[PDB]
Design a protein around this ligand. Structure first.
Ligand code: C5P
Ligand code: MG
Length: 200
């Protein structure tokens, strides 16, 4: 059954980028906040939220961070901070119609880190409540492991390799990582996979 009925009207693909260094910076702060809204049945991209975020605790991006993500200082200077971006997300959700209880959506991330560690950790640091729609998600690696029967070693790169897909854009670009997640999801749906919440 190619592209079977799914349990959600929409999938929200998210992949943060955060301040970093070697050794790792502390604390890390979200600097890129992308969301791709996918049609629940076809996995086609229908809307995009994308904002760079101004870090505050460590406001200057390290050379490693800019080299890893491609995000330069001018992309985060003058941006809203996480608190305001989270308010922009809520407005975006409202306009998309995703705040209707009868519209079922779920976030999809590559790994658990984004919504199990990064966002709650920074929100706790800032004293900000985490919106309830951030508290359930699908770990694509776990989903892939049920669809393909195997554990990918290196995230999106190895999942594209397993599915014979060309990598979209630049690795460690948040928006480009989201497009790869969406492309992997589309192929898994073509193979007949029905996505399920994995977060506990
Ligand atoms: N080698 C790496 C890979 C990721 N990271 C951190 O983890 C974040 C999320 O990783 P991805 O770019 O793989 O999504 C990065 O924005 C960066 O802060 C890192 O600091 N060193
Ligand atoms: Mg990323």
């Amino acid at each position: 059954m190619s592209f079977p009925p799914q349990r959600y009207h929409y999938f929200l693909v998210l992949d943060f980028e955060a301040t970093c260094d070697k050794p790792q910076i502390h604390p890390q702060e979200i600097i890129e906040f992308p969301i791709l809204k996918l049609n629940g049945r076809t996995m086609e991209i229908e809307s995009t939220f994308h904002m760079y975020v101004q870090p505050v605790v460590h406001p200057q991006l390290t050379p490693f961070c800019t080299e890893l993500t491609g995000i330069i200082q001018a992309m985060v200077d003058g941006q809203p901070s996480l608190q305001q971006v989270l308010e922009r997300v809520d407005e975006w959700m409202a306009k998309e119609g995703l705040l209707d209880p009868n519209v079922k959506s779920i976030f999809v991330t590559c790994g658990d880190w984004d919504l199990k560690v990064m966002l709650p950790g920074q929100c706790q640091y800032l004293g900000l409540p985490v919106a309830d729609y951030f508290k359930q998600w699908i770990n694509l690696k776990k989903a892939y492991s049920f669809a393909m029967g195997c554990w990918p070693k290196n995230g999106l790169l190895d999942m594209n390799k397993g599915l014979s897909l060309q990598h979209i854009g630049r690795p460690h670009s948040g928006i480009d990582d989201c497009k790869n997640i969406a492309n992997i999801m589309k192929t898994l749906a073509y193979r007949g996979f029905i996505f399920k919440q994995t977060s506990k």
